[PDB]
């Protein structure tokens, strides 16, 4: 079971945000959850196997969810977006069931065998004979919800700003600046907008010893982040190339990072 969100990482205010989820390893109800930065998880809506949709009441007038079983995909649409709609959007599989029950030590009149079928009573004999201790209630509904599987999520930023692809610079220590047994190299992913960027090393073949730091936001509105890789002094002949992908601008950059020869 894997869920994969796809769509734009950048949209302008007043525009319609349109997202897609790709399901694999299954055909179960699918829902959308989001989390804006600084805020709680927030329900958006879902569509089940039968194709019925349900929405967060406070957002319903702005939402639309459809599905296509052939392509095995579910769509989400959010109208008239503002900065409040900047968030990570998660595609999910959800459990949704509605079991009719009686609230306490109340049992269905159905189960009593007489009075036929109506709602609920505290005791079959008492409410059958009409004893003073009899208590009746209507049938109540118990609604079951939970999320099974989560997608990794798609970051969406609502902004009128144009995209700016990053400038990628090599990071290497000054000469003489501590030949510890381990060397540290890196890439400065400079001055981009919006988030996110993906950084790998050696086309993703190198994962061990990699440390990618969260971005800083300059007052200019442009993000910068750094990723560094540690290298033992014993190591030789290895190349280190950081691969920087920026979906908003559809750019991928490969920067070879050399230690200074000094």
């Amino acid at each position: 079971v894997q869920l994969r969100e796809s769509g734009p990482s950048l949209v302008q205010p007043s525009q319609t945000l349109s997202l897609t989820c790709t399901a694999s390893g299954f055909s179960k109800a699918v829902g959308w959850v989001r989390q804006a930065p600084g805020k709680a998880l927030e329900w958006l809506g879902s569509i089940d196997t039968g194709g019925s949709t349900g929405y967060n009441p406070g957002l319903k007038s702005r939402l639309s969810i459809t599905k296509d079983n052939s392509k095995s995909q579910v769509s989400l649409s959010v109208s008239s977006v503002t900065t409040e709609d900047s968030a990570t959007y998660y595609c999910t599989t959800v459990h949704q069931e509605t079991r009719k029950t009686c609230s306490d030590g109340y049992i269905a009149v159905d189960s009593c065998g007489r009075g036929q079928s109506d709602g609920c009573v505290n005791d079959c004999n008492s409410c059958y004979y009409g004893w003073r201790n009899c208590r009746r209630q209507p049938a109540i509904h118990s609604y079951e919800f939970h999320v099974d599987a989560w997608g990794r999520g798609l970051l969406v930023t609502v902004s009128s700003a144009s995209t700016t692809a990053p400038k990628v610079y090599p990071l290497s220590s000054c000469c003489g600046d501590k030949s510890s047994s381990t060397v540290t190299l890196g890439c400065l992913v400079s001055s981009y907008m919006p988030e996110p960027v993906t950084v790998t090393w050696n086309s993703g073949a190198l994962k061990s010893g990699v440390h990618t730091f969260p971005a800083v936001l300059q007052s200019s509105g442009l993000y910068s982040l750094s990723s560094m890789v540690t290298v033992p002094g014993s190591t030789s002949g290895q190349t280190f190339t950081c691969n920087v992908a920026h979906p908003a601008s559809s750019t991928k950059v490969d920067k070879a990072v050399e230690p200074k020869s000094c």
Binding site: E42, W43, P57, Y90, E144, W150, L188, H211, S226
Partner: protein
């Protein structure tokens, strides 16, 4: 809409136990099907509990859910460093397709060992310098607790402008990482004798310095 009230934050000691409450009404939490989720920044939400008490697949035994009327409780025993996270309860209301989440709880795990920051300061690259700009990058890692203050210096004096420092964020080893950026012109870079990144953590300061004329 509707609100499932959680404490904004809670704390428990290592190896011990902690509880997180989720208070709602009879129309949500009272439905008797509460779920719980764990949120670690930079990671997707993870389902812990559903149907009040049922653990999701892969969830350790030390996570247990319960409910008494319109208040559910998540209980975590044998606390570990990696349990530090945000926790959200949830419940349907008036419909199985109308999910309501709680206000969220941040869990701290006390009694972990203090770890000083490891500091790495990078000079501007030749490439950047050719465009008349210079960014110094101070990378800060492996510190606990997750709070540092950064001071930049030039020739021993405090730099008071063009510094940007990230918040601390948690690493895969439950320690913290952060970074600080000093934005200069290429002329600034070459003119000063030295630049320093000073990182203070629990009253102890770690300083790395670079010298432009000797950086090559």
């Amino acid at each position: 809409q509707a609100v499932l009230n959680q404490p904004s934050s809670v704390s428990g000691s290592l190896g011990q136990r902690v509880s997180i409450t989720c208070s709602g009404s009879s129309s949500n939490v009272g439905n008797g099907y509460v779920s719980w989720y764990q949120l670690i920044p930079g990671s997707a939400p993870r389902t812990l509990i559903y149907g009040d008490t049922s653990r999701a697949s892969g969830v350790p035994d030390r996570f247990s859910g319960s409910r008494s009327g319109n208040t559910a409780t998540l209980t975590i025993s044998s606390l570990q460093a990696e349990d530090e996270a945000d926790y959200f309860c949830a419940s349907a209301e008036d419909s199985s397709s109308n999910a309501v989440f709680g206000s969220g709880t941040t869990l701290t795990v006390l009694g972990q060992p203090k770890s000083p920051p490891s500091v790495t300061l990078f000079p501007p690259s030749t490439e950047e310098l050719n465009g008349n700009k210079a960014t110094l990058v101070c990378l800060i890692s492996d510190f606990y607790p997750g709070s540092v203050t950064v001071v930049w210096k030039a020739d021993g004096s405090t730099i008071t402008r063009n510094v940007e420092t990230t918040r601390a964020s948690k690493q895969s080893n439950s320690k913290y990482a952060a970074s600080s950026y000093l934005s200069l012109t290429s002329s600034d870079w070459k003119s000063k004798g030295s630049y320093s990144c000073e990182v203070t953590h629990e009253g102890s300061t770690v300083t790395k310095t670079v010298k432009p004329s000797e950086c090559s």
